[PDB]
């Protein structure tokens, strides 16, 4: 179970946006930390809409399953306040927010080494999940959090974490899944029961496209029906302007799930582009 956090110790501040059937807020948690020292800690607060309390189980098991596995590239969940009528997940507050917004805002100031480093870290996370046979189910740039920016002073690389998957696509409405093309793989658009470790290899390739497309969203110009016909016609995504990773993107986004390479293989491919 998650460590239950008192409503009394949670302060909700500015709205940061919304997720799939969720409201997200910046907040502060009053807690007793190491050595009995009192802290007021910045927290990310994800609230499940009162209008969609049906997905609470998935909304919370998505964080639970990942939280039992500690890893430097996986987001830290502090606990949950079932604040009465509300279902609230309390998470590590990352300084620089989402990768997709960071890529858009800093498109002209991001080189290939920066993108390689971020891809290697994300693949390391996914490899760790693969070794544990844990399916994420929603790998995308929005679910990558920037802990530290690159530092030209000390040449330090950036550092990222993978966030929780949110409500599983197995229970999400059909219209939500279709909107998530091309992050949801073709076999899951055909049948969500096909959720598999191979799903995350496809989505990982889609996310590599985002990292190389400076924040663009692939197929954003296509409505849901045309996104479906994109999979029907078995099309592949266009090569990004920075095409250094185009081959890996296409190799991951294989219409045959069984042919998608292991994340061990993916990592060795990334290490070879130097
Ligand atoms: C100058 C503008 N910036 C940063 C360049 C910010 O406003 C900002 C936003 C969010 C954080 N922090 C954050 N964000 C998350 O998710 C991403 C958010 C979900 C809802 C959509 C908006 C992003 C998180 N998930 C788990 N811990 C999280 N911590 C820090 C800063």
Numbering used by the authors: 536 to 809
From the paper:
Four hits, i.e., diaminotriazole compounds 1 and Cdk1/2 inhibitor III, and aminopurine analogs Cdk2 inhibitor IV and 7 bound JAK2 JH2 (V617F and wt) and JH1 domains with IC50 values at or below lower detection limit of assay (3.5 µM). Since the compound binding does not induce significant changes in the ATP pocket, we compared the regions around residue 617 and the helix Cα between WT and V617F structures. It has been noted before that compound binding to JAK2 JH2 V617F can disrupt the aromatic packing of F617-F595-F594 and the conformation of F595 and F594 can be reverted back to the JAK2 JH2 WT conformation. In structures complexed with 6, 36, and 16, a WT-like conformation for the phenylalanines was observed. However, the Gln626-Leu624 switch is not present in the complex with 6 but the structure still assumes a WT-like Phe594-Phe595 conformation. Interestingly, the packing of F617 against F595 observed in the V617F-ATP complex was not evident in any of our structures and the residue often displayed poor electron density suggesting high flexibility.
JAK2, like other JAK family members, comprises a catalytically active C-terminal tyrosine kinase domain (JH1), a regulatory pseudokinase domain (JH2), and a Src homology-2 (SH2)-like domain that, together with the N-terminal FERM (N-terminal 4.1, ezrin, radixin, moesin) domain, forms the major receptor interaction moiety. The JH2 domain has a key role in mediating both negative and positive regulation of JAK kinase activity and numerous disease mutations locate in JH2, including the prevalent hyperactivating JAK2 V617F in MPN. Previous studies have demonstrated that JAK2 JH2 binds ATP and possesses regulatory autophosphorylation activity on Ser523 and Tyr570. To gain insights on the compound binding modes to JAK2 JH2 and to analyze whether any differences could be observed between binding to WT and V617F, we determined the crystal structures of selected small molecules with JAK2 JH2 WT and V617F.
